[PDB]
DNA sequence: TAAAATCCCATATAATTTT
DNA sequence: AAAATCCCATATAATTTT
DNA sequence: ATTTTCAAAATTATATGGGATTTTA
DNA sequence: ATTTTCAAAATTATATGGGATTTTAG
């Protein structure tokens, strides 16, 4: 009767998932264990009670997107039960836009000189000077942080000047490092090298030092290593950025965008190209976007004037 | 507890549909009455039985898309049936794992044959009439019923703007009617080329002897059937067929058979997409509900295609 | 010279494609 | 020389990506 | 239509720890 | 995540009467 652990039924028979999926799955479970909704009988839950849940999540302090993803998880869990011959009527099929307001504070990319002031700061700052070449690469590839982390020496071709992104190196508490196919589950992609990331990649390998024995799922010779001599992870480069941009903020009047993270580097790269008139399907391949809709979100909303102005551009 | 009865049940509980839709529903309803499947009680329908049906639909002569769309119609009906009892859906499969897709390539007009086409139309006595409409179609990529539905109130020569707010349809029994978008997303505005603007200025002067006509507050339609009433998608299509035929007997090189009013639109979108027009903007002009459709006009990128794009821009 | 095939307009109807 | 502040490293929880 | 759109799977954000500098006493 | 994606809603193809336009055979 519970929804706390009749939700556990859904995830049990949908078992083959990534580790990071198991973590988020557990989060929702403990939310249900904390929330009143958890103990409610499965056939007792009405559409009103589901809406109130969302409100409680926002009062609890969770993000709009966070709650929204949770509605979908709960929508599917019960949706099974509706199809699973248990008492049927789904309370979680509504639009969260009616209940709550989307207060998702947008992520603003860096501007051509904003990033230049950043790079110039780093270039000569002995502490974070070392990470300069990694950052340049992020702005010239649009790699996910774990895809950069996962770059082994076999994944680079300096002849054709091309990066072969075929996997990523993930680490989570408990399992340590592990290997996954890219979140580009659509497949594999090659990313060419401009001259500057090329020069950056050369220096990285040359500056590689003190690499401890480390091979996982057949992958061995990584370029980007921690102080340990072990490869970098997401959280390592993340927290590294948090100190660096803070270091920047102290000496620079205008602060960097609120979420200037490795992830933002990828965002900037894409935004630059999309606003440069790159073929939307060309950019999709490069960004490893499984969905073309995702790639389009980096293109600006169109109006009659913009469309018309464009139409004359191609006319003459 | 019959496939026919079930489909009849489904389409009953969903009546808020336009005329063409209930036409398409009855067409499928006829199939269920005729095909072996329709008699089957939904208690005893299997994934096997569904895939058999599709195989019969292929041998019948029906295209993949017809079968696939009808599959989805029937798939929907079973979704209704699971809730009120039925545990699983017989039509929850992929037609591609049952049927191969022979759907013919809809090829755009090469600028040379497009050029040769217009001069031909401009040339011969019988078809110089519709030169203006055809040029307008090509230079604006309007859907044929959006064209037929155009009136003087929908034009803006004072700023060269075409307001698509509606479409004039015509049907058997029903007659003429107009369908409007509930959302304001359906309204879209198209710029006028000097070619297009002038072409529309030469159709006003030639609109002759119009029969008295107003439908849902829409009157003075620009486009000209010789019986005094506005022309129709069917009335345009038939003419196109005759037009192309006389062209192809005159010309050795030409011309694609899929040539049709919507081929003008398909051509419009292709030449624009290839020339590098912003996808968001191109979606606006085309009036696509889904943005993915616009991108079907963009040839998928290879690593080589990705190679070129960046070597240009990334500097 | 009148005579027969066939282009043409229109439309009911069934199948295909857009999105 | 003592005490903050920083760098690097984690475990845990929430948010963004697709 | 097809594809996750009936959430998976990544990322950032936050809390805690010494040891190394940096900075005040 | 929403968007139709458990088809709606368009357009094109096929077939057939009338009526003008030029065909092949008197």
Author numbering:
A (entry chain B): 82 to 397
B (entry chain A): 82 to 166, 168 to 397
Give the original sentences from the paper that presented this experimental model:
Most known CTns, including the Tn916-like family, have Y-transposases that use a conserved tyrosine residue to attack a phosphorous atom in the DNA backbone.
Hydrophobic interactions and hydrogen bonds keep Y380 in a buried position, where it is unable to act as a nucleophile in DNA cleavage. However, in strand exchange Y380F was completely inactive, whereas Y379F was active as the unmutated protein. In agreement, in vivo assays in E.coli showed that Y380 is critical for Tn1549 excision, whereas Y379 is dismissible (Lambertsen et al., 2018).
